[PDB]
Amino acid sequence: SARIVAGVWWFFTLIIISSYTANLA
Amino acid sequence: SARIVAGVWWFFTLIIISSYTANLA
């Protein structure tokens, strides 16, 4: 139950931080 | 107590490494 939550949130924050890095770049 | 310290520090080092990567790019 919590595993998919952690996974989805992890993917979410991953794409977000990568996008931030790219934009700043 | 320590949870928000780890969180804030994580956010901090996150912004810093993203900024470094972007700048170097």
Strands annotated E in A1-25? none
Contacts of B14 in chain A (CB under 8 A): 17
User: Which DSSP helix (H) or strand (E) runs through B16?
Assistant: helix B2-24
Resolution (A): 3.6
Experimental method: X-ray
Distance between A19 CA and the closest CA of chain B, angstroms:
10
Q: Kindly determine whether residue B21 and residue A20, on different chains, have CB atoms separated by under 8 Å.
A: no
Q: Kindly determine whether residue B22 and residue A22, on different chains, have CB atoms separated by under 8 Å.
A: yes
**The two three-digit tokens of residue A4, written as one number:** 């998919």
What is the rounded distance in angstroms from the CA atom of residue B4 to the CA atom of residue B21? 25
- With tokens 């107590």, the residue in question is B1
Contacts of B16 in chain A (CB under 8 A): none
